[PDB]
Design a protein around this ligand. Structure first.
Ligand SMILES: NC(=O)c1ccc[n+]([C@@H]2O[C@H](COP(=O)([O-])OP(=O)(O)OC[C@H]3O[C@@H](n4cnc5c(N)ncnc54)[C@H](OP(=O)(O)O)[C@@H]3O)[C@@H](O)[C@H]2O)c1
Ligand SMILES: Nc1nc(=O)c2c([nH]1)NC[C@@H](CCc1ccc(C(=O)N[C@@H](CCC(=O)O)C(=O)O)cc1)C2
Length: 186
């Protein structure tokens, strides 16, 4: 119903996962950023929707599923029902977005947040219309087996600052990182 957004943390070499976990150790303030961004609704009375692929769902600690305070939707072409704990299942991003337009979610959902994995990000990034990418740049190389798609920097523009997002380099566990926001109006 509201805006469509992707949110990701990436290493310099564009890595987002290794062996089903993040490639870096837990960065607690970065996690809190993810939590604040995906949970905070712009409309009182509504929740945000988080959309994620099957492997991403199972990469969330069981104790944290479903992500509290958000509506959790899993994408999968083979699952018959959503994995235990998930609220919805769709076969594709387009089907998920259509679902948000139906009466069951139309008055329940505010923002839509895409939270991975790679194929889901790629699909979202190319989807027509206004889209924002909330990218945490982890300023180190990390061995990774899963990567974020390349961002077309003509098509997307980096916003110089963004309300509610810190601009300075952050550091936790000796790992420096910075929060970035990209936008297309497409
Ligand atoms: N650093 C980050 O911000 C970030 C973000 C997200 C994930 N990750 C990491 O990346 C890894 C998991 O991500 P992933 O890329 O491997 O997988 P994923 O997309 O979460 O899951 C792959 C499965 O999801 C389903 N799926 C994915 N895209 C679909 C689509 N467009 N339409 C229909 N179904 C779709 C497919 O299920 P079916 O085979 O059942 O059809 C596919 O087998 C983990 O290591 C996780 O920690 C990192
Ligand atoms: N900015 C940013 N940082 C990140 O760590 C991630 C994303 N974006 N996007 C994708 C995400 C990978 C999938 C994932 C999503 C959520 C969680 C999770 O346990 N979330 C909880 C705790 C906070 C957290 O661990 O991020 C929550 O939101 O309440 C664990 C894994 C990891």
């Amino acid at each position: 119903v509201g805006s469509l957004n992707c949110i990701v943390a990436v290493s310099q070499n564009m890595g987002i996962g290794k062996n089903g976990d993040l490639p870096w150790p837990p960065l607690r303030n970065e996690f809190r950023y993810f939590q604040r961004m995906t949970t905070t609704s712009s409309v009182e009375g509504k929740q945000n929707l988080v959309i994620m692929g099957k492997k991403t769902w199972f990469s969330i600690p069981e104790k944290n599923r479903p992500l509290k305070g958000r509506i959790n939707l899993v994408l999968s072409r083979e699952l018959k029902e959503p994995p235990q704990g998930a609220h919805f299942l769709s076969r594709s991003l387009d089907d998920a977005l259509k679902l948000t337009e139906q009466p069951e979610l139309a008055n329940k959902v505010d923002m839509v947040w895409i939270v991975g994995g790679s194929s889901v990000y790629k699909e979202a990034m190319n989807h027509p219309g206004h889209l924002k990418l909330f990218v945490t740049r982890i300023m180190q190389d990390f061995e990774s087996d899963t990567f974020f798609p390349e961002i077309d920097l003509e098509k997307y523009k980096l916003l110089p600052e963004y309300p509610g997002v810190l601009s300075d380099v952050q550091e936790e566990k000796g790992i420096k990182y910075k929060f970035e926001v990209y936008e297309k109006n497409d």
